[PDB]
Design a protein around this nucleic acid. Structure first.
Lengths: 205, 132, 85, 82, 262, 123
RNA sequence: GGUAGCUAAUACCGCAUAACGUCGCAAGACCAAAGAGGGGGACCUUCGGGCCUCUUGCCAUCGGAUGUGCCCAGAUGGGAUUAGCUAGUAGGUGGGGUAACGGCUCACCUAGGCGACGAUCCCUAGCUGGUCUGAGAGGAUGACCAGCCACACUGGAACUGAGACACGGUCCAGACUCCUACGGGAGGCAGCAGUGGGGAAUAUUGCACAAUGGGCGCAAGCCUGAUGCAGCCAUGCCGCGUGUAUGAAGAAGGCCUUCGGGUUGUAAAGUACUUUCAGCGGGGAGGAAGGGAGUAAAGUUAAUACCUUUGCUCAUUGACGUUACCCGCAGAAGAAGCACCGGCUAACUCCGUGCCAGCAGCCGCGGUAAUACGGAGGGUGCAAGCGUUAAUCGGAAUUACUG
């Protein structure tokens, strides 16, 4: 129920970096990035109003590791939710515990930020959270499992982490390994090559 | 002579074997009227002795041709409680008969006095001595 | 049908018979009062009516001519018996 | 016989009864007259666990109405006025 | 009647049966039967099967709890047949030497020992392997279960046993000796209104029905799968063309028998 | 037009007609298969399309298409028909499911085997 | 089962007794019922137990609550290639009836009564809450769940009782079937599970009343396929995992190349790393409240008895259960497929092929170099699923009230 394959092959189709092969040397490249997402990558994809609309979400999914059968519901969710359903879907996409993990540098990739939330190596205001889908409310504080604390991996992660853009709605630590959900991410403090409406539409047809 | 070891000792569970068309099934039907299970009697293929009374060849095809697979019986004779088997005669056909011998402590062989000892008669003794 | 409560059957029959007569006595008596009417014996009328008055009330309290049913009988009777006599 | 009882409206293993005035004869979750509180056999040491319109229960008992024996174990395990 | 007088007079009370544990005296208590047969079950309103059990020791009583030694699962008994002459009868309670009937639902086989607890199995019961031929391909142009159902119901019995390859159709049956006729006849008696005929089939073996450790098997269930079958009872088997092609198959190696088990 | 008119003779919906009426309007059906022929399609195309006239279970007898290169079918058989027409052969409003009941899947097909019914050959 | 005879009760039945009851304007008429337990000082009498007493039980009148009758109106499918329908029919009066009004019934009497806002007659159909779809108005539907209704082999009938016209009651008829010593008998799974049959297709002849609820019972307790669990099936909706990192001018192999190379490809390898979920081992919540044993209560009483009540003492109560859950053990070990790539529609080539073979939802592909056929490479979209067929609403402002 996860990708499990040529992850760059992906970011090459999106022509952008999806934060996939994060790890050590952040800021991708080195793989052919761009000129060949397949066997005809060289080509000039003059795509349709559809393309520049599916590819938009087909991205958002990947830039988080989420899937369809489930992504939809997120949208349906945001829909019921008052306000720009566009930013809302984002608000819920960011609100993912598998995300708050990675985002708080407690793990390299948003992929490496799962194998643990899955293998019970994290938790909230107590109870260890097994589902890489938990929806983190406000205040809700995580904390790498006091158990397998700082190990032959997670340490090397925090390194590049705090040297990255750095969030604004979380009050992470470092050795105490236990961030917090200060507040729900506004629209102004997050974005890039990501359009709301362009995806809020695909599900309106 | 407690009500347990008494029931055990008064029991007796046996086979009836022979070569195809010897008398198994008939002697069986007759053993059944000596046990007050059949108030009349019959024959085989429902034949020469009339009346829709054949019988006690279970099945169906049996009553069309002649005998197929072990029918089993329990009746009282004299001071005992007999458990009676009815073992099919035919090479290819059984099997079964052999496995049925595993349930008997002893065994009765019918022989066609018009034929003497036939083939599966000889083969059945071999199987018998397996268990003395 | 093989269900213990079948004795509810023979149990009913008993009361069926019983009631039947009780009830059969009920009317048979009421009738006598009507016979007097289709005749004109105001004297024998109030007579049969009195020898019924309680006989009807009884099988009532017992539960066969339940409440009101009682009233009606005597009611429309005491009404006709004098309406023309 | 209007008996005040509980219906099992929980979910596999995690029940959730509901005190209700109902004609003794009906089915468990069958027709009833009026919910009058509930009963949570889970809850776990937190805030709630049971609720009952005690000053309503009385109105029924008032018109004669037998109470379940498991319903009675609630009418008091939660006191009466203290 | 003399031979009967002779029968009563001389012939043994229930005898001891041997096991891989001990000489089992008939005198003992603690129930100990062993099946031995799952008769050609027609049978007037059921698949029944009703396995025929011998009762070596102990007294059976209707509500008692027993242990199927083979599957190592404890089983409670209720409907336990007593056969009043080719006829089911309800049902009583039994003593050593009698013959009791049960109710096979893929739980009973042949030689399945039943105790009250003692984990042991009777060393008796023959169980040999079939020869072959066949391909019942049916008139009645189908259905299809009733034929198949008929076949996967005459097969938890000991006589024959079917073989259904991985091509849905192509039904193979194998094969007591050569009396493949009761099949045809029970194909239009018992409770199946089918008809059915035969052919010749490129199968010498028989086969022999395999299983052991994983992965290796999945490489086996793949390479020579052409070629591989599956039975009524949901496992397992091969089906070969000759003896040489049988040897090479096993020779793929080294994972297990032989296996017949009826 | 007018309300009064609509009030009177009210507007009447126009029911739909299932292009495939081999009864029950149900998934698929079992059929004895009366004959196994091959025909020619409309003007533009020119093949030797394979078809079978099947006696369904509900009594309706109908002609069905046999998709894929080759089949085991013949005389009797017992296919199970599906749906979807064959705009090239008129009258052929049904497709017999491949690799179902007495029908053998297309031999060797490796692509889109879900249809033409075939099993993964040595992964 | 038949005949005879004895025997008890809260079985049955008089008599007595009567109002706040029934009948009657009133006078007066007339109506009822059962006892049985645990005790226990006097006295104790024909020392059975009388009696004192609490405890459940019975009669009667008026009420409470619930439950059920019954009545009126509006609405509740299609068909006029259905336009007329009806005599107890419509009303009256008067007897009878019912628990009750009532044509319910009967007698007599007026002659009516319904109907194109669609009667009647056919065809179809369990109705509502709701369910699916839709921006909505609507369209479709009424499995699971709850309310109302109806039926319980077919047809009919009554009986018992507070209530049945009675799924596991009775009587009759019918069809069917089963047992018989042959004279006569017996039964109806649309309760649970199960077999046959039919079908594209629909589950185990399981466990326990431990919990909630029902019947009886003073109570304990008994009964309870109701219920609660379990077994089968990806049928589905919500989860989750089959690995996470790091990695070369980028292996061999495959496939394409105008051969200069490109690409599957970080993909694999290799290097680190994590082991949820399975598998093995342990430890172990909650669903239990209660009832069953003793001590106290201006609790009533003649009473420390007996009975209830409330604290308190001990022993104790589960089917599911190798539970849910928690901790280790081991190791990426044990877990990916299906559809699609001419357009709508995201996604390309080679080879074969030759209007053959075949594709196709619509247009439309194939008669030698086909991105539409089959295969291969590659790519695209979904994922324990994917596809197809089927069905409904949408798009369909393509019955348009909104429109």
């Amino acid at each position: 129920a996860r990708y499990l394959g040529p992850k760059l092959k992906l970011s090459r189709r999106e022509g952008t970096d999806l934060f996939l092969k994060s790890g050590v040397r952040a800021i991708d490249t080195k793989c052919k990035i761009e000129q060949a997402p397949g066997q005809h990558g060289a080509r000039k994809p003059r795509l349709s109003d559809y393309g520049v609309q599916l590819r938009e979400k087909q991205k958002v999914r990947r830039i988080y590791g989420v899937l369809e059968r489930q992504f939809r519901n997120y949208y349906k969710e945001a829909a019921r939710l008052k306000g720009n359903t566009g930013e809302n879907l984002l608000a819920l996409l960011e609100g993912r515990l598998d995300n708050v993990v990675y985002r708080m540098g407690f793990g390299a990739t948003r992929a490496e930020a799962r194998q643990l939330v899955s293998h019970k190596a994290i938790m909230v205001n107590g109870r260890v959270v097994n589902i890489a889908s938990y929806q983190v409310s406000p205040n809700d504080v995580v904390s790498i499992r006091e158990k397998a604390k700082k190990q032959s991996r997670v340490k090397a992660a925090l390194e590049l982490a705090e040297q990255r853009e750095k969030p604004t709605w979380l009050e992470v630590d470092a050795g105490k390994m236990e961030g917090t959900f200060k507040r729900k991410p506004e629209r102004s403090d997050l974005s890039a090559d990501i359009n709301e409406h362009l995806i809020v539409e695909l599900y309106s047809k | 002579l407690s009500p347990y070891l008494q029931e055990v000792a008064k029991r007796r569970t046996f086979a009836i074997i022979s070569h195809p068309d010897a008398g198994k099934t008939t002697i069986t039907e007759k053993v059944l009227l000596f046990g007050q299970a059949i108030q009349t009697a019959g024959t085989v293929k429902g034949r020469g002795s009339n009346q829709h009374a054949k019988s006690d060849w279970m099945e169906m095809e049996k009553q069309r041709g002649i005998s197929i697979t072990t029918s089993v019986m329990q009746f009282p004779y004299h001071d005992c409680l007999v458990n009676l088997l009815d073992t099919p005669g035919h090479e290819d056909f059984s099997e079964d008969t052999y496995r049925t011998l595993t349930a008997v402590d002893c065994c009765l062989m019918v022989i066609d006095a018009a034929k003497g000892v036939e083939d599966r008669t000889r083969k059945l003794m071999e199987v018998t001595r397996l268990r003395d | 049908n093989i269900k213990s409560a079948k004795k509810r059957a023979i149990q009913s029959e008993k009361a069926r018979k019983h009631n039947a007569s009780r009830r059969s006595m009920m009317r048979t008596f009421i009738k006598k009062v009507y016979a007097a009417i289709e005749a004109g014996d105001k004297a024998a009328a109030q007579k049969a009516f009195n020898e019924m008055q309680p006989i009807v009330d009884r099988q009532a309290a017992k539960g066969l001519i339940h409440k009101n049913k009682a009233a009606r009988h005597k009611a429309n009777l005491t009404a006709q018996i004098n309406k023309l006599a | 016989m209007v008996t005040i009882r509980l219906a099992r409206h929980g979910a596999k293993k995690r029940p959730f009864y509901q005190v209700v005035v109902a004609d003794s004869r009906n089915a468990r979750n069958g027709r009833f007259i009026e919910r009058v509180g509930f009963f949570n056999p889970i809850a776990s040491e937190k805030e709630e666990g049971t609720r009952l319109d005690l000053d309503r229960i009385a109105h029924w008992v008032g018109q004669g109405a037998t109470i379940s024996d498991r319903v009675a174990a609630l009418i008091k395990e939660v006191n009466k006025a203290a | 009647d003399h031979m009967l007088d002779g029968l009563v007079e001389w012939a043994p009370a229930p005898m001891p049966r041997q096991t891989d544990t001990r000489t089992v005296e008939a005198s003992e208590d603690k129930f100990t039967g062993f099946v031995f047969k799952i008769q050609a079950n027609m049978d007037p309103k059921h698949r029944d099967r009703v396995a025929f059990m011998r009762v070596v020791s102990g007294k059976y009583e209707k509500g008692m709890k027993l242990r199927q030694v083979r599957t190592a699962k404890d089983v409670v008994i209720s409907d336990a047949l007593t056969f009043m002459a080719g006829d089911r009868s309800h049902v009583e309670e039994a003593y050593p030497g009698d013959i009791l009937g049960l109710h096979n639902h893929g739980t009973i086989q042949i030689g399945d020992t039943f105790t009250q607890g003692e984990m042991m199995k009777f060393t008796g019961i023959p169980n040999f392997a079939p020869e072959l031929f066949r391909r019942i391909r049916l008139k009645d142009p189908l259905k299809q279960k009733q034929l198949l159902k008929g076949l996967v119901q005459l097969s938890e019995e000991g006589a024959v046993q079917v073989f259904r390859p991985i091509s849905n159709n192509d039904l193979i049956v194998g094969a007591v000796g050569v009396l493949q006729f009761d099949v045809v006849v029970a194909r239009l008696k018992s409770e199946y209104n089918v008809e059915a005929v035969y052919e010749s089939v490129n199968v010498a073996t028989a086969r022999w029905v395999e299983c052991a450790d994983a992965k290796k098997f999945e490489e086996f269930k793949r390479k020579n799968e052409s070629q591989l079958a599956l039975d009524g009872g949901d496992n397992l088997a091969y089906i070969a063309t000759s003896m040489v092609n049988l040897r090479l198959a096993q020779e793929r190696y080294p994972d297990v028998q032989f296996h017949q088990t009826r | 037009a007018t309300v009064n008119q609509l009030v009177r003779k009210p507007r009447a919906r126009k029911v739909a007609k299932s292009n495939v009426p081999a009864l029950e309007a149900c998934p698929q059906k079992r059929g004895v298969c009366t004959r196994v022929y091959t025909t020619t399609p409309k003007k533009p195309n020119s093949a030797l399309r394979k078809v079978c006239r099947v006696r369904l279970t509900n009594g309706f007898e109908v002609t069905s298409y046999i998709g894929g290169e080759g089949h085991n079918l013949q005389e009797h058989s017992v296919i199970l028909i599906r749906g979807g027409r064959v705009k090239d052969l008129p009258g052929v409003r049904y497709h017999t499911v491949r690799g179902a009941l007495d029908c053998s899947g297309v031999k060797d097909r490796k692509q889109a085997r879900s249809k033409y019914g075939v099993k993964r050959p040595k992964a």
